[PDB]
Design a binder for these strands. Structure first.
Ligand SMILES: Nc1nc2c(ncn2[C@H]2CC[C@@H](COP(=O)(O)OP(=O)(O)OP(=O)(O)O)O2)c(=O)[nH]1
Ligand SMILES: CN(C(=S)Cn1[nH]c2cccc-2c1C(F)(F)F)c1ccccc1
Ligand SMILES: [Mg+2]
Length: 637
DNA sequence: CGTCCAATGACAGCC
DNA sequence: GGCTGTCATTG
């Protein structure tokens, strides 16, 4: 059945364990975490950052069968000759290469950060996370749990999870300290399960030709994101508090001016109070198909009364305060080693198309610079580098357009993209009948939504509502698009044809997203899967290229510079040196770079992004350096 | 009965 | 009166 071998209990048992561990090219580990329920428990270990009530008491190692070698990280040991420092030397020796070696870890990112921050050990091997392999086999599946992995890929070992309800809680069984069971038993069971399950997962990856995407792209991306979560992103409380005051002052002016237009005071959060003022008092025309106060209704009423425009601006500013300012100042944390405050978002790579997003908080959703008549409110000014550094931004110009041109072989789109004329400003120039140089960011952003909207199947009705024209007139723009770019339309038709035949779509690297609704009887559900088939290939291939570029940049930074890998590595152990990954923005990479290395990192980042993948269209990359996320300026190198 | 896609998440407003 | 999804925002 099961066998748990406490290797720190005997010297001869420990030396035999180290001698065998140093010969294994593949094994699994699972950290044993327990919570300090009482001071009388007399449990020793390493404290965890954030969860100070939780200790790392040990570690389980498994390299075959149902045998778990528990590595006790407690001060007390049955063999006092094996001091904790001796065990740390041997644990560090076996977790760092000299020599290919693969370590299977469930929730690799958290385990990597805990091993570094709590135990002072930096992993230096090849990493395999089973939850990432489960995502490659089906990007639309539910986020994996230890119980779900065993239920699907190792059903014979299901009784080993009885009693421990935490197996179905996404988080690692050994890392979930909220369990009442010992970390020794939870880690020993998990190491045996994730090791044998990864063998079946690796077999399924090889059958689906995804074993190289797993080792070269996805798992190295997790390592890059692990350094990101260790770095965090700088945060200026003063700048965030300053713009909060400017926004709260504009709200008071709007509320004062709105009440005067209404004749009385009303609640901006109450739609009934808003509907009574506009429709029952101001006698504004209700919508066709309805006392609705949505964004679509208020935009049609802006031209009849100034109050709808004031309500729309109140909601925009209030959203920037209640859902951005408050979470950022709530999640901020002091970093004594850098002498500044930072925010540490958690990455999320279990997405439908392969994009990367962030949680707690979602830095990607920080609002752009929007004008306020009092000026511009730039929430991104609050994100600053460390004293003596600059924030570096490098983004692909139009990555999804250039991938679409490379896949559709459209000679006209390739010709337009090879020319330095902005497509969005050219669309707005034809739209509003203005010169391209006179197109503002608000109009260019509106033309951007129209461009990608039409490409991914937006209908004539929605296009008319976007372009502010009749539905009959909007269908002519779609007809012109399907005639002006016959290569794109041939790509859209063949993709739906191939997805109806295969039942899935493939990105540029081979990742499959299964879309069973492609043959559904419902006309809305069937067309939704058709639009998903077009978008998953383009948007998914863009995510693949960015992940490739991120991995290559990090490989180059760790060779050009012998400094610390992340800000967490400086804490686990000199002025700051190099560039530090802080944020990924789908088609844009943000790095915190010291002022001395700004020029070299900009050249390293730009070269790796342009040479990540070879397409039939040039991958144009722009680099911008500034004193904050909102003060970025063009940097030509 | 809802026809661009992807994503997170605090409140109005529930059923 | 807690429990969603909805309509904010970003790419
Ligand atoms: N389907 C869809 N995709 C979008 C939309 N907006 C952005 N995207 C995708 C396509 C490209 C990717 C990055 O968009 P950006 O906002 O960076 O715009 P861009 O096309 O890169 O141009 P630029 O960076 O010069 O603004 O996000 C949209 O409204 N619909
Ligand atoms: C008729 N038209 C065209 S073709 C503009 N265009 N150029 C593109 C290169 C790649 C996609 C493109 C589009 C698109 F938007 F159609 F998808 C247009 C549509 C709306 C407003 C103004 C012009
Ligand atoms: Mg961009």
């Amino acid at each position: 059945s099961l066998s748990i071998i406490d290797v720190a209990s005997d010297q001869n048992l420990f030396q035999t364990f180290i001698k065998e561990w140093r010969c294994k090219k593949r094994f699994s580990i699972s950290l044993a975490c327990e919570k300090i329920r009482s001071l009388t428990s007399s449990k020793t270990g390493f404290p965890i950052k954030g969860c100070d009530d939780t200790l790392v008491v040990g570690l389980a190692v498994c390299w075959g069968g149902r045998d778990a070698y528990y590595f006790s990280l407690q001060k007390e040991s049955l063999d006092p000759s094996l001091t904790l420092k001796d065990r740390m030397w041997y644990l560090q020796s076996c977790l760092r290469k000299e020599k290919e070696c693969s370590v299977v870890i469930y929730d690799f990112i958290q385990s990597y950060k805990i091993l570094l921050l709590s135990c002072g050990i930096s992993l230096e091997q090849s990493y395999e996370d089973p939850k990432v392999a489960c995502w490659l086999l089906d990007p639309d599946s539910q986020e994996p749990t230890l119980h779900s992995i065993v239920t699907s890929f190792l059903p014979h070992e299901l009784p080993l999870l009885e009693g421990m309800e935490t197996s179905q809680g996404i988080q690692s069984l050994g890392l979930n300290a909220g369990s009442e069971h010992s970390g020794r038993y939870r880690a020993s069971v998990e190491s045996i399960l994730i090791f044998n399950s990864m063998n079946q997962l690796n077999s399924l990856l090889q059958k689906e030709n995804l074993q190289d995407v797993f080792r070269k792209v996805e798992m190295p991306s997790q390592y890059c994101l692990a350094l990101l979560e260790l770095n965090g992103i700088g945060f200026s409380t003063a700048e965030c508090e300053s713009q909060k005051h400017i926004m709260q002052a504009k709200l008071d002016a709007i509320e004062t001016q709105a009440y005067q237009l209404a004749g009385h005071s009303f609640s901006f959060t109450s739609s009934d109070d808003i509907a009574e003022v506009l429709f029952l008092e101001l006698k504004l025309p209700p919508n066709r198909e309805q006392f609705s106060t949505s964004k679509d209704v208020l935009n049609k009423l802006k031209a009849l009364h100034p109050l709808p425009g004031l309500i729309l601006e109140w909601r925009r500013i209030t959203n920037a305060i209640t859902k951005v300012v408050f979470p950022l100042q709530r999640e901020k944390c002091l970093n004594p080693f850098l002498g500044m405050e930072r925010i540490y978002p958690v990455s999320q790579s279990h997405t439908a198309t392969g994009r990367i997003t962030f949680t707690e908080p979602n830095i990607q959703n920080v609002p752009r610079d929007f004008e306020i008549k009092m000026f511009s409110i730039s929430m991104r000014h609050a994100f600053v580098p460390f004293p003596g550094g600059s924030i570096l931004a490098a983004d692909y110009s139009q990555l999804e357009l250039r991938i679409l041109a490379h896949l559709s072989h459209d000679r006209r789109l390739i010709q337009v993209l090879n020319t330095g004329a902005d497509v969005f400003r050219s669309i707005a120039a034809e739209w509003k009948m203005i010169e391209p140089e006179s197109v503002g960011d608000d109009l260019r952003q509106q033309a951007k939504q129209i461009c990608y909207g039409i490409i991914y199947g937006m209908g004539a009705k929605s296009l008319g509502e976007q372009m502010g024209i009749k539905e009959n007139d909007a269908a002519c723009y779609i007809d012109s698009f399907k005639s002006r770019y016959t290569g794109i339309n041939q790509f859209m038709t063949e993709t739906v044809k191939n997805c109806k035949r295969d039942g899935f779509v493939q990105t540029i690297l081979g990742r499959r997203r299964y879309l069973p609704g492609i043959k559904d009887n419902n006309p809305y559900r069937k067309a939704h899967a058709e639009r998903q088939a077009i978008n998953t290939i383009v948007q998914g291939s863009a995510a693949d290229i960015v992940k490739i570029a991120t991995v290559n940049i990090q490989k180059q930074l760790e060779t050009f510079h012998s400094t610390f890998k992340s800000h967490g590595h400086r804490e686990g152990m000199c002025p700051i040196r190099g560039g530090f990954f802080i944020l990924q923005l789908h088609d844009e990479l943000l790095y915190e770079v010291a002022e001395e290395d700004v020029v070299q990192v900009a050249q390293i980042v730009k070269n790796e992004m342009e040479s990540a993948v070879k397409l039939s269209v040039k991958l144009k990359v722009k680099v911008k350096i500034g004193a904050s996320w909102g003060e970025l300026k063009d940097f030509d190198v």
